[PDB]
Amino acid sequence: CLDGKDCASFFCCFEDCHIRIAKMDSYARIFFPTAFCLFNLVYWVSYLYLG
Amino acid sequence: DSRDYSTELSVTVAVGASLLFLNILAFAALYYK
Amino acid sequence: YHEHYMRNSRAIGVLWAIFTICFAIINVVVFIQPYWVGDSVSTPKPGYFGLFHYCVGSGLAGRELTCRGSFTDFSTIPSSAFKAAAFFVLLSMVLILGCITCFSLFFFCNTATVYKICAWMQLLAALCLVLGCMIFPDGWDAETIRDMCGAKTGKYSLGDCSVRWAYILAIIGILNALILSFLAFVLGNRQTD
Numbered sequence: 594c595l596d597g598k599d600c601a602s603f604f605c606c607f608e609d610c611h612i613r614i615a616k617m618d619s620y621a622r623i624f625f626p627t628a629f630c631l632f633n634l635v636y637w638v639s640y641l642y643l644g
Numbered sequence: 645d646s647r648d649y650s651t652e653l654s655v656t657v658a659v660g661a662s663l664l665f666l667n668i669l670a671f672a673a674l675y676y677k
Numbered sequence: 678y679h680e681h682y683m684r685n686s687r688a689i690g691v692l693w694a695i696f697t698i699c700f701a702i703i704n705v706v707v708f709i710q711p712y713w714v715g716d717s718v719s720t721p722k723p724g725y726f727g728l729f730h731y732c733v734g735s736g737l738a739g740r741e742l743t744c745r746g747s748f749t750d751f752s753t754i755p756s757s758a759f760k761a762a763a764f765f766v767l768l769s770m771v772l773i774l775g776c777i778t779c780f781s782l783f784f785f786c787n788t789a790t791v792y793k794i795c796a797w798m799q800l801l802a803a804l805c806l807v808l809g810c811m812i813f814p815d816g817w818d819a820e821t822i823r824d825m826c827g828a829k830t831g832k833y834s835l836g837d838c839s840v841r842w843a844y845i846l847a848i849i850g851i852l853n854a855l856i857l858s859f860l861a862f863v864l865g866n867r868q869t870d
């Protein structure tokens with residue numbers, strides 16, 4: 594907090610954020626495939642190479 | 645097998661030091677107004 | 678000035694993402710590899726044990742390392758402290774992979790918002806890793822670890838066994854997670870400028 598703001602204002606997001614919920618589908622369309630790809634990568638590499 | 649841990653510890657701390665040096669380089673670059 | 682500022686911010690953001698992937702790789706490596714603590718010259722038997730998996734020796738001029746332990750079977754884990762440490766490391770891994778997902782949100786969501794979201798989750802992952810590495814020492818008093826190392830071993834007492842590369846790598850992961858999270862906090866605040 595060296596910039597000279599409150600701890601919460603420096604840290605958290607109590608300025609706008611909820612409101613932007615209509616874009617949940619747009620977020621999910623790329624969020625969910627990325628999560629599944631990551632899970633597949635870590636699962637398969639752990640169970641095949643490192644395990 | 646020679647149950648000694650010198651090379652492994654050395655490379656481990658070397659890689660850790662390199663990563664931390666890059667991180668502090670980024671921090672110093674950000675704090676260089 | 679503005680073009681240089683924007684280019685520097687983008688470059689540091691890309692570097693921060695690269696080191697975030699590196700920290701996720703470190704978390705996966707330390708969780709999977711069972712090389713937290715290991716034998717020494719004076720140990721009764723050779724071997725090495727991580728969060729849940731352990732491979733003690735047989736004890737007859739031989740290798741004979743019996744690898745038993747699996748996080749998927751909590752019974753095989755020697756100690757409740759080991760169980761808790763594995764759980765906390767897993768939660769930290771879940772959080773950091775959560776950020777490897779949330780990098781996708783940069784397309785649509787506000788850059789400051791996404792940066793803050795991973796700044797907080799990286800802080801939480803660092804806290805979980807600290808808790809795991811602080812509670813893992815409590816488990817050496819268990820009978821299996823006592824047989825592995827010796828009578829000198831105890832709670833927060835190595836005895837004769839020696840920390841191998843995974844434990845110190847975990848410590849580097851903790852402090853790198855902390856500095857990366859702070860970098861994320863300030864980067865998110867810097868987007869608004």
Ligand SMILES: CCCCCCCC/C=C\CCCCCCCC(=O)O[C@H](COC(=O)CCCCCCCCCCCCCCC)COP(=O)(O)OC[C@@H](O)CO
Pocket residue numbers: 627687690691694695698777778780781783784785786787788
């Ligand atoms: C092995 C592990 C593999 C894991 C896979 C990791 C990959 C995960 C999946 C997708 C990543 C998608 C990243 C997309 C980044 C593109 C970011 C971008 O679009 O450009 C701008 C800059 O953003 C930014 O500086 C943020 C920078 C993005 C940093 C995160 C991406 C990291 C990619 C590095 C990958 C290296 C892999 C190598 C590993 C060995 C933001 O746009 P914009 O102004 O219009 O928005 C403002 C708002 O008002 C509307 O969006």
Ligand SMILES: CC(C)CCC[C@@H](C)[C@H]1CC[C@H]2[C@@H]3CC=C4C[C@@H](O)CC[C@]4(C)[C@H]3CC[C@]12C
Pocket residue numbers: 628629631632635636639640644709747748749770771774775778
């Ligand atoms: C949804 C996204 C953000 C996170 C996904 C986390 C994934 C990668 C996690 C969740 C549970 C994890 C598994 C939990 C238990 C074990 C058993 C252990 O002996 C090897 C690792 C392994 C097999 C883990 C691999 C990684 C894993 C599959």
Ligand SMILES: [Cl-]
Pocket residue numbers: 746747748749750
């Ligand atoms: Cl397992």
